[PDB]
Design goal:
Chain A: Its main location: membrane. Chain A: It comes from Homo sapiens. The structure is a homodimer. The first copy, chain A, is mainly alpha-helical. Helices cover 75% and strands 0% of the residues of chain A.
Amino acid sequence: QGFDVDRDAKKLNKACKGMGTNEAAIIEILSGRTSDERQQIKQKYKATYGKELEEVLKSELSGNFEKTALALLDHPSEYAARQLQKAMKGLGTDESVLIEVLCTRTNKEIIAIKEAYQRLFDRSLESDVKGDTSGNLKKILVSLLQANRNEGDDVDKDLAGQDAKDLYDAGEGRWDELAFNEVLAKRSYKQLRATFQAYQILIGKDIEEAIEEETSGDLQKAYLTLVRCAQDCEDYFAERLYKSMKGAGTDEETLIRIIVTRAEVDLQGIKAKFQEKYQKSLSDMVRSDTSGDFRKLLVALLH
Amino acid sequence: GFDVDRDAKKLNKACKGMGTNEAAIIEILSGRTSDERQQIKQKYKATYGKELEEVLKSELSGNFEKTALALLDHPSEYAARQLQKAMKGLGTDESVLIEVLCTRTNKEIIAIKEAYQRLFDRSLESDVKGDTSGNLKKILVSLLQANRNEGDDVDKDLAGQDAKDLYDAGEGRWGTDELAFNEVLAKRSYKQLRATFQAYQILIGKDIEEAIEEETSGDLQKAYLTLVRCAQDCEDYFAERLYKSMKGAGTDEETLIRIIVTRAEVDLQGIKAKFQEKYQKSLSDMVRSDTSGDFRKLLVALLH
């Protein structure tokens, strides 16, 4: 009945500036509330308005802005379970996500992940791990799933000395992998730090050199991850955040998983170690390697 | 302090606002012709000082953004983008390259070559020669010449003679003469090729597609069958490609967008009709069951 170019270009402007206002409100709520507060909001939303909040966002958000929003609406253990289930695509496939989660979680966190996995997918996380890995990698990951790591406060100096000697002899092929599995999975992080410094004194190498020389493949990555996590877990995640950005493609899945799951664990320590390690802030590199509403949400999560 | 009722109320306000704002964007991107929204894109830049495509990239995401930006490009430019994205190695896959080059007229092949030069400072013919191989390279370059006969006359003597040539080029015990198939399927008219196919059926007893499936292989076969099917019934070709791109939980949504967008003002209404007859269900219904979110609303709106 009459093409009005000025009318159409006007309500497009009104709609676009409305998108930015609403997304700003969504970003404000998701990045300004704790996980428990977000759970209270999500429950109150469905009671008052009769719809599941996660469902409403699925129908109006897209891309990595939607993935981050739904990740923040899950419990940290639930999103970790969704990440593990998504990454297990058969034997021989990439295992980095399974190594990252299991080698950096406490006993209570691993138990919460195993509970979430069983509830979300009607199967045990251990069964899928046994069917997706093999060799000594299966042993160590299934071992970590037992969630029985020593988590006391005390250090046994004589035990740290004996473990260091046993780890060196296992690299020489005495009584080659069962010793690394037992020490790295069951000793406390504080006990392992004493074990590593004793290994440096006795042998002359740091334990990471010995691992790089005596192991390879995904098993080496798991041992190095357990060592890095016990010495400085914030430095580990800072490097994983950095390496996931170098490139125009950018593994944004790793970016979301680390920022969301570690938010109320050690995200502030990760940001400090990141600045000290790369002379740039983690937030500054998000702006350099992301864009759109997804960048705006991550920057808000980094404060 | 922390007010749960306030934040949930603020969220419901922001959620209803995004539904309203997206409805306004969908109603315009699907309610205006390509020329009409080309004026809106330039009018938006003059009135508000920001390019519309850049404003949408910062607020839209996913395949909703991909469709929105596809509707704001000329169908020649978006076809050139699809070629540049799918071109990434000597082997790889050539589905997008075969689909576009074997279904466009001379006027449309030129506009893609022009847009590809303007967008990427590169020759589309040059990039094809580096990505393709074998006789698939020779036929796709031959289509890029945009010199196919587009007359209305049909030479019945030539249709019968080309039919004999296409049979002799596949019955040679030395090797299938692929240079002869590249000649007929690329330079004869669509209406001329139909007569060539009818003559081949009468002379040989096999359909021309049955002869291709047992005398060529790989992507060269896919290029031939695409040329035959678009010359025979191009609305039925895109009807199948739309159907098979959705049969599955994965759903190739890139192909779904590329077809609906590049063929919107060409023969999309003919594609929708052939889809209904071919599968007993409308394209709008199958899209409604194999997509979700604001991406589904924008597709349903594009199908009217």
